[PDB]
Design a protein around this ligand. Structure first.
Ligand SMILES: [Mg+2]
Ligand SMILES: [Mg+2]
Ligand SMILES: [Mg+2]
Ligand SMILES: [Mg+2]
Ligand SMILES: [Mg+2]
Ligand SMILES: [Mg+2]
Ligand SMILES: [Mg+2]
Ligand SMILES: [Mg+2]
Lengths: 153, 266, 115, 230, 48
């Protein structure tokens, strides 16, 4: 019975899972975009979203400072976290990370892998799945419906 | 275009509702006792189709009731066609109620939680909390073996299952398997409070099934309350028939209302 | 919750409940059909090497709401005729025992404090 | 019948029950329960009190000599959500400690009176069972104490003595996080080191098990203000 | 009111060469903190 559970089992236990998530978060902060297992990336998405909110609380916040000290193992990233990611994420409320499933790893394990990326990074854009243009047949029919609805009012 | 309303008869039966299980609350009685009520919210109850008595059973007619609204983009073509011909958006849970021919209602009629009045006995049908493939101790309640008196890999085994001479096991043997994900009905649940604005029914006792799930509510078929529907609105509750707004909350004669003088014994 | 083999504390002033003994008074049998006894259930005790009857006063297990809970399994000695053998009861007694006065008339007549 | 002239004047909180649980229960149930509990509070005045404060509760007892029954004690803990909130009162009467769990919104309660509004170092002091009887003994006929608002409910920093082992629970484990117990006089250094093996430091920085209720508390406060203005 | 940043020194229990150098600095600092020359020599030559 796993009803009402939000944390999945990873590593050798709870502390091992926490350490793995901390290492993944440190790598994500350092490189602005990382790729890992799909489950690991999905689990790390929440912590990545929470870290930006903690950083937005200010540099002088002792709780945020000690949280960053615990999580970001590389202490050179804490100033980066408080002076790059937080300042560039101000008007954004919860759109801090992007997660996309990539094809399975070429190794024999054939694991299901995902890639997480901080928005606004200085990296080439990923091949995001773009919607069809409005010039398509169905899109043009929907545009005609929209125009008729607008003209009806 | 309302269908003709027939007078209530002693051998008649009324139609039920489909509500949503919100949660549980306490409720104190005027005698000092404390009961636990469950909140069933009637979001979207609508009569979908009508089946004749002869074509459904040959004794009682069948009325089809829909639950809360769902999206069109995830329903089948036949269901979408049926709902398009009916004129209503698709519902989540579709149920059938056995009603007498004199209590039939036109399809497309909405239903409200005021169908049940304070003080009545209802039966609740729902799929209970499915615990999955559970062991025999949790399923049938079989006692386990001693924990540390030498037992080897047996603390939860069922033990013996049959007899030597039979050379087989009986089909009625209790064994581990699926548990919980089955439809069960609780009978004789008393209703204390009816909230009209939010369409909420307060039913005494536990309701089978998890919270935020569809629940089929009907009258009590127990012989003790076979003829309790005489005082209730026979066809259904018509908010437009009376042309009078009911109070926000209807309580029973024994329910200690939130606005109370803090009753003290004498 | 008072069951078999429970070491209880005698409240009423009696020779058995006052004179020290080398073995604490343990429960013998609960007269209720369930093996677990609650407040207001006749019970059997082995006090100082002899059998006796008693009435449960309070237990350390939480019960119904607004029901007093004690830090010791307090019991009052009772005779086979239903009359307590003690003179008076000093420790507080739950008020729920006064609901049933017919069987606990003389038992509650010697109680001083009600809680 | 002379007139006596005293004082010249010459000198110049959201209750815990209103917090909804962390479950995925529909907010309509919470709204209905909050409306009902506000309606109950309109008649029964529920004062502000924390864990460790001393209260007196009047209950409707039919089997007593008088229909009113008074019980005074210190609030061991408060738990529950909505209309079913309960609080535990502990008091030692004639050497026998009695703990009663009252319901905040029970109609049989006549009056709740805070005789000493005072905080303590622990959010839940369940250890009074294993503590000395002096910390659980309180006079039933004590008089209420009125304090100024500027005192901001001063917290009583009191170290409590402990009975010898065993105890009701393992209060030395980090999961309890108790500072009000004088451990240096009751436990040894080896026991203190041993109890640290159950510590879970990652739970303080998990960042995901925390419960944020800023907007929920704001909405609840707005509803309370609307009900009061109603 | 003033930002307080932790030192940017490497980790102590890591497998990295920076961590190994930090441990080397730690034991050299232990040698420095040693009081007597006999203890200093014992610590400096206890490895074989
Ligand atoms: Mg399940
Ligand atoms: Mg067993
Ligand atoms: Mg063996
Ligand atoms: Mg074994
Ligand atoms: Mg073996
Ligand atoms: Mg055969
Ligand atoms: Mg003998
Ligand atoms: Mg225990």
């Amino acid at each position: 019975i796993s009803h009402g559970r939000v944390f999945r089992r990873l590593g050798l236990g709870p502390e091992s899972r926490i350490h793995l998530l901390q290492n993944l978060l440190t790598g994500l902060v350092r490189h602005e975009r990382i790729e890992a297992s799909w489950a690991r990336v999905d689990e790390l998405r929440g912590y990545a979203e929470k870290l930006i909110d903690y950083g937005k609380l200010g540099d002088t916040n002792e709780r945020a400072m000690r949280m960053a000290d615990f999580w970001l193992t590389e202490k050179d990233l804490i100033p980066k976290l408080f002076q790059v990611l937080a300042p560039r994420f101000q008007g954004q409320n919860g759109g801090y990370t992007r997660m996309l499933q990539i094809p399975n790893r070429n190794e024999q394990d054939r694991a299901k892998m995902a890639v997480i990326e901080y928005k606004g990074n200085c990296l080439p854009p990923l091949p995001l799945p773009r919607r069809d243009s409005n010039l398509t047949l169905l899109n043009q029919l929907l545009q005609g419906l929209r125009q008729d609805q607008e003209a009806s009012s | 275009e309302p269908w003709p309303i027939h007078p209530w008869e002693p051998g008649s039966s009324r139609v039920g509702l489909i509500a949503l299980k919100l949660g549980m609350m306490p409720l104190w009685t005027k005698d000092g006792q404390k009961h636990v009520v469950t909140l069933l919210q009637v979001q979207d109850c609508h009569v979908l189709k009508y089946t004749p008595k002869e074509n459904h059973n040959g004794r009682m007619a069948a009325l089809t009731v829909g639950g809360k609204t769902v999206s069109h983009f995830h329903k089948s073509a036949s269901i979408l066609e049926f709902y398009q011909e009916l004129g209503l958006p698709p519902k989540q849970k579709v149920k059938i109620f056995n009603v007498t021919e004199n209590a039939v209602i036109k399809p497309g009629t909405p239903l409200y939680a005021a169908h049940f009045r304070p003080g009545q006995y209802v039966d609740v049908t729902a799929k209970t909390i499915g615990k999955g493939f559970q062991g025999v101790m949790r399923r049938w309640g079989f006692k386990g073996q001693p924990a540390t008196h030498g037992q080897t890999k047996t603390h939860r085994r069922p033990g013996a299952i049959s007899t030597g001479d039979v050379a087989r096991v009986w089909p009625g043997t209790k064994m581990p398997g699926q548990l919980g994900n089955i439809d069960r009905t609780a009978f004789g649940l008393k209703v204390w409070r009816i909230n009209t604005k939010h369409n909420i029914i307060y039913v005494n006792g536990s309701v089978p099934g998890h919270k935020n799930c569809l629940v089929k509510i009907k009258d009590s078929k127990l012989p003790a309350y076979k003829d309790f529907c005489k005082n209730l609105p026979f066809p259904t509750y018509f908010p437009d028939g009376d042309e009078e707004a009911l109070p926000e909350d209807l309580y029973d004669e024994n329910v200690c209302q939130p606005g109370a003088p803090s009753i003290t014994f004498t | 919750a008072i069951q078999k083999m429970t070491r209880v504390r005698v409240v009423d002033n009696s020779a058995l409940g006052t004179t020290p003994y080398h073995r604490p008074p343990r429960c013998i049998h609960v007269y209720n059909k369930t093996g677990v006894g609650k407040v207001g259930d006749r019970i059997l005790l082995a006090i100082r090497g002899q059998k006796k009857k008693a009435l449960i006063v309070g237990h350390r297990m939480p019960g119904p709401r607004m029901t007093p809970r004690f830090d010791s399994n307090n019991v009052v000695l009772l005779e086979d005729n239903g009359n307590p053998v003690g003179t008076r009861i000093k420790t507080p007694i739950p008020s729920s025992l006064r609901q049933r006065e017919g069987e606990f008339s003389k038992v509650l007549a010697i109680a001083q404090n009600f809680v | 019948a002379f007139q006596p002239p005293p004082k010249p004047v010459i000198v110049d909180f959201l209750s815990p029950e209103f917090i909804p649980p962390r479950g995925r229960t529909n907010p309509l149930k919470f709204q209905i329960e909050r409306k009902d509990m506000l309606e109950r509070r309109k008649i029964l005045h529920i004062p502000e009190f924390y864990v460790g404060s001393i209260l007196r509760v009047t209950t409707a007892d039919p089997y007593a000599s008088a229909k009113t029954s008074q019980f005074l004690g210190i609030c061991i803990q408060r738990s529950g959500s909505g209309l079913g909130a309960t609080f535990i009162l502990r008091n030692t009467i004639e050497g026998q400690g009695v703990e009663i769990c009252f319901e905040l919104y029970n109609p049989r309660i006549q009056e709740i009176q805070v005789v000493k509004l005072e905080k303590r170092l622990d959010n839940s002091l369940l250890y009074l069972r294993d503590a000395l009887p002096e910390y659980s003994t309180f006079d039933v006929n004590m008089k209420p104490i009125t304090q100024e608002f500027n005192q901001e409910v001063p917290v009583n920093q009191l170290k409590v003595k402990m009975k010898p082992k065993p105890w009701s629970k393992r209060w030395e484990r980090p999961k309890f996080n108790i500072k009000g117990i004088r451990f240096d006089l009751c436990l040894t250094e080896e026991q203190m080191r041993e109890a640290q093996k159950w510590s879970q430091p990652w739970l303080e920085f998990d960042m995901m098990r925390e419960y944020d209720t800023s907007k929920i508390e704001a909405a609840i406060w707005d509803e309370i203000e609307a009900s009061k203005n109603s | 009111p003033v930002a307080r940043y932790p030192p940017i020194v490497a980790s102590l229990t890591a497998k990295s060469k920076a961590a190994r150098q930090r441990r080397v600095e730690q034991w050299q600092a232990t040698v420095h903190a040693a009081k007597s020359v006999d203890e200093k020599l014992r610590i400096l030559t206890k490895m074989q």
